[PDB]
């Protein structure tokens, strides 16, 4: 048969980075797509997983194996062993600020590769329990991407889909 690659790429709304949605993809598969950097397999002709998230424009560099940053370490981590990204400025950027997308700024330990964390627990930095009250040494784990269409080229939102082939 053919592959529903058209239902992840051309999807209505992608999920936020921290809650990166994964879709399992029997078919053989042959836009601007700014970065079509591929690491896992050489570009030449059992299952594959499609991970779709929304990250800041410049953060596309962080979605690579052996890369160290907030996105990779905390939000979405890739194992050391293709990636497609397009700019969604006119699609996912509200003038008053599209705070719908969130990223994980505070985490005790780095994320395991392909691990997924949807926790909303207050980062307990100090030795006093935060009991659901944000204050000193008690900071919310997630921050909101300020997404305005008038943002710079870097800060414009870029829809990204990750393909992870599994034989």
């Amino acid at each position, epitope marked *: 048969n053919l592959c529903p690659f058209g239902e992840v790429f051309n999807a209505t709304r992608f999920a936020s980075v921290y809650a990166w949605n994964r879709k399992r993809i029997n078919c053989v598969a042959d836009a601007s797509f700014s970065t079509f950097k591929c690491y896992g397999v050489s570009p030449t002709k059992t299952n594959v997983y499609a991970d779709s998230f929304v990250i800041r424009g410049d953060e596309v560099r962080q979605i690579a194996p052996g890369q160290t940053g907030k996105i990779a370490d905390y939000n979405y981590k890739l194992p050391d062993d293709c990636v497609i990204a397009w700019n969604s400025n006119n699609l996912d950027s509200k003038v008053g600020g599209n705070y719908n997308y969130l990223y994980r*700024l*505070f985490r005790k330990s780095n994320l395991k590769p392909f691990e997924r964390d949807i926790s909303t627990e207050i*980062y307990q*930095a*100090g*030795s*006093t329990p935060c009991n659901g009250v944000e*204050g*000193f*040494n008690c*900071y*919310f784990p997630l*921050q909101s991407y300020g997404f305005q269409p008038t943002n710079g080229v870097g800060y414009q939102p870029y829809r990204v889909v990750v393909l992870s082939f599994e034989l």
Partner: antibody
Framework: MQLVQSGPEVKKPGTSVKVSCKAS????????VQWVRQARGQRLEWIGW????????NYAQKFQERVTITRDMSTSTAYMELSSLRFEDTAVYYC???????????????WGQGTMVTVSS | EIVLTQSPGTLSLSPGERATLSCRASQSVSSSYLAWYQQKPGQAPRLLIY???SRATGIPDRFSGSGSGTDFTLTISRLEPEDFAVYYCQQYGNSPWTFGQGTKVEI
């Protein structure tokens, strides 16, 4: 481990002064910088505090318009700028942060030397 | 707003005498967020007690902190020559964070 504040500052009324507090020795990421001002032989006054990691800022209503507290993780330096300087704003300004090496120590244990901003026509 | 009232204004005692300084608040403050600071003449403050009762690292054993709710007290059992300074009490629980007028330790 220490916090090193900026050198003494001499500014005119109506300008804006920026005092730099640079963190060294402790993991500045999960820390939080608090700015306190003290005039000669007078009680301490608290401007505001910033979560270094999140960047979220909370200001006392006194300096709401007049100050902006920022930080730069590349230089491990926190900044506090007081705008529309008045003669009465002349005082030493202190920078306080918690030694948050592993666990954040639950207390402002690091205080800077202070910066002396003198405002006069 | 939290009001931090310190008593007394000027406290004068001889070395080897117990110093009982008190810090009072308007509305109860979280006991985990009540610090005491020591201010030397022309020096940056150094935190004595954090958490209203836990002593800081590198602080002599003579300094001890107590109190909960609206009342907090700092106790110095063995006053020393270097122990003469002003003592400020700050709360970092509820916004805005406030500082006391400070109590002076004299001879």
């Amino acid at each position: 481990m220490q916090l090193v504040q900026s050198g003494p500052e001499v500014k005119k009324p109506g300008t804006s002064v920026k005092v730099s507090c640079k963190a060294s020795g402790f993991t500045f990421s999960i820390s939080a910088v608090q700015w306190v001002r003290q005039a000669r032989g007078q009680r301490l006054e608290w401007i505001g505090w910033i979560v270094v990691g999140s960047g979220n800022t909370n200001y006392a209503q006194k300096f709401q318009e007049r100050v902006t507290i920022t930080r730069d993780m590349s230089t491990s330096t926190a900044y506090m700028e007081l705008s529309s300087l008045r003669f009465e704003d002349t005082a030493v300004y202190y920078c306080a942060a918690p030694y948050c090496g592993g666990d954040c120590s639950d207390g402002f244990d690091i205080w800077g030397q202070g910066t002396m901003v003198t405002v006069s026509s | 707003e939290i009001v931090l009232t310190q008593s007394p204004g000027t406290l004068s005692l001889s070395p080897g005498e117990r110093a009982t300084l008190s810090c009072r608040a308007s509305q109860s403050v979280s006991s985990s967020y009540l610090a005491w600071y020591q201010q030397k003449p022309g020096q940056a403050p150094r935190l004595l007690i954090y958490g209203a009762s836990s002593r800081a690292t590198g602080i002599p054993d003579r300094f001890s902190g107590s109190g909960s709710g609206t009342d907090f007290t700092l106790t110095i059992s063995r006053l020393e020559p270097e122990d003469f300074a002003v003592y400020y009490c700050q709360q970092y629980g509820n916004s805005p964070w406030t500082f006391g007028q400070g109590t002076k330790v004299e001879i």
